[PDB]
């Protein structure tokens, strides 16, 4: 709240640390700053009035501080911070400084997968409602840079390290989307579970027990077959259901696949919990086009929809895409890149019944192609397949780039593979 006259030191010269430096100068406080790296990226932007230390942690500076603002990350485990901690010196992170200062409600989101899409979705839901929403945190802009007296709602993506140094978060709605197998999960999960303390509503995953406040709160839940928000398949259609009532035929959304339907359900629940109008939140679900390379619809013309799912660099990812994949006509699935000797058999079950076409390429193209040589087709590069499927597509079709494999034998990173795909789709399309 008031930091005047406090000796404050910041650990971290990246954008978060710079954001904190700005935060204290704005309040008449010249903090000190350090970074283990010898040349941190941020050193270049510091006001000369602030003292800085690089290449290590200045212990003298830590031990003498009244407040230590640590940047989230493995740095939180550094023995120097722990001694300062053992000496009773207050340690907080930017999210903690943010919560003490925020004058609008916060929707807090954490998870091991999908967190970015969900956080973006809720933002989209806010915008569709005409609300001045600030979205960021562990993604986009550092929370402190969102502080604005005119902001009407904050949507933050929080990581485990951030939650570890946060204690005054009082989220209007909070969720741990999922806790997957990527220190010890017990401390990982305990970190994530603090997103629920003092949360007005808790949104949990009905299909992942680790996302639950061990109920101890009576939480709202989303899931595939069960929960307050869940999927329903009846009478040849799949619907999103809320408290038993149908609220949206999945077909009205642009994002398809189970994964995306649970994401939609989770954002819907958080949006409802935050008090946004249901109809404007539903509206956003029909217009959302996706984050870069994540079931991103780069182009929708001549009745065909072109989806860039490059991020899908493994069978599990491509499987989240296919399962529940809605396509009126034919799916021209683009499989490619280096699979690192992986079992594609799980994909096969999603490629039957005459309305499918594979266009395999890259290093392991032969193999995926084999996943069903019948409807397959093989090339060395992705641009071939593009020009090879373009004359074949007609209205109702979807062109999908869900590699199920890595990108290196011909691309810098999946962002290169996807950027191209978008480019090629521009003309090809």
CB 93 within 8 A of CB 72: yes
> Who contacts 218 (Cβ-Cβ below 8 Å, separation ≥6)?
none
338 Cα distance to chain centroid: 24
Task: Report the distance separating Cα 401 and Cα 322, nearest Å.
Answer: 11
Token pair 């954008």 is found at: 15
Strand order across the beta sheet in which 398-401 lies: 296-301, 304-308, 398-401, 331-335, 356-360
Token pair 């959304």 is found at: 253
Q: Which residues pair with 421 in a beta bridge?
A: none
- Tokens standing for 50? 């602030």
Shared fold status for 1-92 and 93-290: no
**How far is CA 76 from each of CA 11, 186, 242, rounded to the nearest angstrom?**
9, 17, 40
CB 175 within 8 A of CB 227: no
Task: Report the distance separating Cα 83 and Cα 371, nearest Å.
Answer: 56
Closest by alpha carbon to 167, among 201, 197, 135? 197
Task: Fill in the DSSP letter of residue 305.
Answer: E
Task: Report the distance separating Cα 203 and Cα 267, nearest Å.
Answer: 10
- Tokens standing for 164? 């570890």
- Tokens standing for 426? 């521009």
Q: What is the CA radius of gyration of the chain?
A: 24
280-238-246 Cα angle (round to 5): 50
Token pair 């998870």 is found at: 111
325-331-332 Cα angle (round to 5): 135
**How far is CA 374 from each of CA 318, 353, 390, rounded to the nearest angstrom?**
20, 12, 19
3-state helix, strand, coil in the chain (%, to 5): 35, 20, 45
Task: Report the distance separating Cα 187 and Cα 68, nearest Å.
Answer: 22
Question: 3-class DSSP state for residue 253?
Answer: coil
- CATH number belonging to the domain at 291-423, selected among 3.90.190.20, 2.60.40.420, 3.90.870.10, 3.75.10.10: 3.90.190.20
First vs last C-alpha separation in the chain: 54
CB 308 within 8 A of CB 400: no
CATH code at 1-92: 3.40.50.720
Architecture of the domain made up of 93-290: 3-Layer(aba) Sandwich (3.40)
Q: Which residues are annotated as a binding site?
A: 111-117
Task: Report the distance separating Cα 242 and Cα 238, nearest Å.
Answer: 13
Residue ranges per structural domain of the chain: 1-92, 93-290, 291-423
Question: 3-class DSSP state for residue 417?
Answer: helix
- The stretches of 35-145 forming alpha helices (DSSP H) are 59-63, 79-86, 94-101, 115-128
Question: 3-class DSSP state for residue 369?
Answer: helix
Burial class (CB in 10 A: 0-12, 13-18, 19+), 113: middle
Q: Which residues are annotated as a binding site for ATP?
A: 111-117
Query: In terms of DSSP bridges, do strands 237-242 and 245-249 run parallel, antiparallel, or are they unpaired?
Result: antiparallel
Strand order across the beta sheet in which 133-137 lies: 133-137, 153-157, 106-110, 173-176, 201-205, 220-223, 229-234, 237-242, 245-249
52-54-57 Cα angle (round to 5): 95
Task: Report the distance separating Cα 102 and Cα 96, nearest Å.
Answer: 10
Token pair 């009532």 is found at: 245
Task: Report the distance separating Cα 74 and Cα 126, nearest Å.
Answer: 33
> Who contacts 58 (Cβ-Cβ below 8 Å, separation ≥6)?
32, 34
CB 150 within 8 A of CB 178: no
Closest by alpha carbon to 210, among 182, 177, 183, 184? 177
CB 385 within 8 A of CB 361: yes
Residue 418 backbone dihedrals phi, psi, to 5 degrees: -75, -35
Method for structure elucidation: X-ray
Resolution limit, Å:
2.4
Closest by alpha carbon to 189, among 136, 106, 110? 110
| Dihedral sign (CA 31, 37, 43, 49) | positive
């Amino acid at each position: 709240a008031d930091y005047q006259g406090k000796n404050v030191v910041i650990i971290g010269l990246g954008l978060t640390g710079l954001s904190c430096v700005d935060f204290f100068l704005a309040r008449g406080v010249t903090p000190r700053v350090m970074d283990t790296r010898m040349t941190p990226p941020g050193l270049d932007k510091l006001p000369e009035a602030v003292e800085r230390h690089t290449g290590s942690l200045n212990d003298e500076w830590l031990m003498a501080a009244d407040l230590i603002v640590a940047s989230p990350g493995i740095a939180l485990a550094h023995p120097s911070l722990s001694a300062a901690a053992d000496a009773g010196i207050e340690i907080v992170g930017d999210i903690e400084l943010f919560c003490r200062e925020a004058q609008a409600p916060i929707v807090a989101i954490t998870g091991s997968n999908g967190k970015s899409t969900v956080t973006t979705l809720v933002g989209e839901m806010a915008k569709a409602a005409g609300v001045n929403v600030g979205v960021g945190g562990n993604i986009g802009l550092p929370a402190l840079m969102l502080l604005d007296d005119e902001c009407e709602l904050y949507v933050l993506e929080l990581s485990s390290f951030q939650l570890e140094t946060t204690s005054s978060l009082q989220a209007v709605a909070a969720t741990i989307l999922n806790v997957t197998e990527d220190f010890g999960l017990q401390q990982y999960r305990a970190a994530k579970l603090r997103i629920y303390e003092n949360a007005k509503v808790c949104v949990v995953n009905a299909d992942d027990a680790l996302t639950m406040p061990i109920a101890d709160e009576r939480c709202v839940s989303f899931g595939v077959n069960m929960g307050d928000y869940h999927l329903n398949h009846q009478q040849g259609e799949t619907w999103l259901r809320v408290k038993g009532e149908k609220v949206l035929n999945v077909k009205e959304m642009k994002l398809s696949g189970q994964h995306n339907y649970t994401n939609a359900l989770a954002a819907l629940a958080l949006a409802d919990a935050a008090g946004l109008p249901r109809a404007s939140s539903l509206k956003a679900l029909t217009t959302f086009t996706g984050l870069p390379h994540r079931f991103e619809v780069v182009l929708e013309h001549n009745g065909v929809r072109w989806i860039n799912d490059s991020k899908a660099t493994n069978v599990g990812s491509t499987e989240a895409a296919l399962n529940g994949l809605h396509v009126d006509g034919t799916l021209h699935l683009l499989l490619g890149g280096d699979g690192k000797s992986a079992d594609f058999s799980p994909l096969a079950r999603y490629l039957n019944g005459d309305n499918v076409r594979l266009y395999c390429f890259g290093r392991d193209g032969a193999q995926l192609a084999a996943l069903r040589p019948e409807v397959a087709e093989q090339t060395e590069t992705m641009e071939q397949a593009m020009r090879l499927l373009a004359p074949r597509v007609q209205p109702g079709d979807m062109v999908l780039l869900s590699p199920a494999c890595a990108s290196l034998d011909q691309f810098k990173n999946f962002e290169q593979r996807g950027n191209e795909f978008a480019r090629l789709a521009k003309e090809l399309g």
